[PDB]
Amino acid sequence: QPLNKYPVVFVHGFLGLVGDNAPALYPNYWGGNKFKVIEELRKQGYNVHQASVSAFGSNYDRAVQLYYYIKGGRVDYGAAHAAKYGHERYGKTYKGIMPNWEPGKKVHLVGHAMGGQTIRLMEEFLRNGNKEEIAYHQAHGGEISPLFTGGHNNMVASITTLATPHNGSQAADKFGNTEAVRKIMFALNRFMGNKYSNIDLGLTQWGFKQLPNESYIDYIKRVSKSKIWTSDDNAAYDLTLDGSAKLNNMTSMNPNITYTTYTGVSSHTGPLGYENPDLGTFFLMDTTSRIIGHDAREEWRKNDGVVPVISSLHPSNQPFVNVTNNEPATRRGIWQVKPILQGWDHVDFIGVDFLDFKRKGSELANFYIGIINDLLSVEATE
């Protein structure tokens, strides 16, 4: 039936909420009002989905959730990980989009921003498992998630990243991950865990769900003991240069996977060689753009608003090849880096910059269809 033989799963980044989990008023993540990615691609006969994973959690937590989003079942972050970081072992349970997902039944993975890192980690787990969990289950018995065992291949056809901070962002190091702003984020998470909340910001495994008969006062007191407040097992840490380097250091290339990256630039050079945001950079990224743009290291300056070009092109010191827009992007095992999209800020990739009339719905439609064409090419050249 579907034009694509392998389902396409779109994976949101940091802060992203999709589907039923999005607030009463909130942007449509995948395409804004410019091009409704899921609805329009389905209309054209493609089998596509938008994953729903933790908005504030670590790449680790998100990758586990991605696995269960696809496969179905109760999220298991692993006994060793849970014990190390101090959060629940078990999380939400997903219906599962492909309950029969197993070697042979592949999926295409496309990540926006942090979603691009989450996708890399999950594939890491399928192929190589998680050594701390393998060791823990060796030593202590129990059950180990099949996600953590290793030896699961032929499950992902492709990894495509849009404005992914593969090498981290100074906007995390110098803003997102500062103590002051972690506190803001964690307070939001505490609040949206209240007993009248219908939205899950992705840190409930840390205790941020108020019980039906618990007072707010008691809730505050209970969750102030959580390790979340000082942990590095969260998104803000993972998005720093160091946090992202750690992920780069534990990933490897899969020779069967087609890897491709897209990157935008939305800054311009000033007289001193610093980068400032273009008019048209979605305004909430003006300061973050300036922070990145004023880096001491010149090659870390050009940026899409919140991710420097050098972070998005490809993980540092993984194999890559610069590719043209026209040619087949059908090489396996190597990051195919697409030419930089001029004027595209971080959120232009998902169409939510409603203030930017230069970035048209029809342009965004062509961009997404071009990704699907590449994915079809991957399938055709198996």
Ligand X SMILES: CCCCCCCCCCC/C=C\CCCCC(=O)O
Q: Which residues bind Cl ion (CB under 5 A)?
A: 146, 197, 200
Q: How far is the CB of 98 from ligand 6NA (least distance, A)?
A: 27
- For residue 284, state whether it binds ligand 6NA (rule: CB under 6 A): yes
Q: 270 vs 218, 278, 307, CA distance in Å?
A: 52, 11, 18
Assess 307 for contact with ligand X (CB under 6 A): yes
User: Which residue among 169, 204, 226, 336 contacts ligand X (CB under 6 A)?
Assistant: 169
Residue nearest to ligand 6NA as judged by C-beta position: 23
Q: Does 280 bind Ca ion (CB under 5 A)?
A: yes
Q: What mask, x for binding ligand OCA by CB under 6 A, covers residues 22 to 51?
A: -x-xx-------------------------
Q: Interface mask (CB under 6 A) for ligand X, residues 309-348, using x and -?
A: --------------------------------------x-
In angstroms, the CA 162 to CA 350 distance is: 9
C-alpha of 289 from chain center = 20
Does 26 engage in binding with ligand 6NA (CB under 6 A)?
yes
Is position 15 an interface residue for ligand OCA (rule: CB under 6 A)? yes
Q: Of these, 3, 45, 216, 355, which contacts ligand 6NA (CB under 6 A)?
A: 216
CA distances from 92 to 95, 143, 187 (A): 10, 18, 21
DSSP 245: H
**In what helix (H) or strand (E) does residue 84 lie, and over which residues does it extend?**
helix 79-85
The end-to-end CA distance of the chain, in Å, is 19
Which residue from 170, 161, 171, 120 is spatially nearest to 313, judged by alpha carbons?
161
Out of Mg ion, Zn ion, ligand DAO, none, what residue 61 binds, judged by CB under 5 to 8 A for its kind, is: Zn ion
User: Which residues, at least 6 apart from 118, have a Cβ–Cβ distance to it below 8 Å?
Assistant: 11, 53, 59, 62, 63, 66, 111
Q: Which does 146 bind (CB under 5 to 8 A by kind): Cl ion, ligand 6NA, a copy of itself, none?
A: Cl ion
Considering CB distances under 5 to 8 angstroms, the limit depending on partner class, which of Cl ion, Ca ion, a copy of itself, none binds residue 348? Ca ion
Give CA–CA dist 24/16, Å, rounded: 14
Q: Looking at 190, 209, 302, 359, which residue binds ligand DAO (CB under 6 A)?
A: 190
Distances in Å between the Cα of 1 and the Cα atoms of 4, 40, 42, 44, 369 are 9, 16, 12, 12, 18
Q: Is 270 in the site for a copy of itself (CB under 8 A)?
A: no
Residue ranges of the binding site for Ca(2+): 280, 345, 348, 353, 356
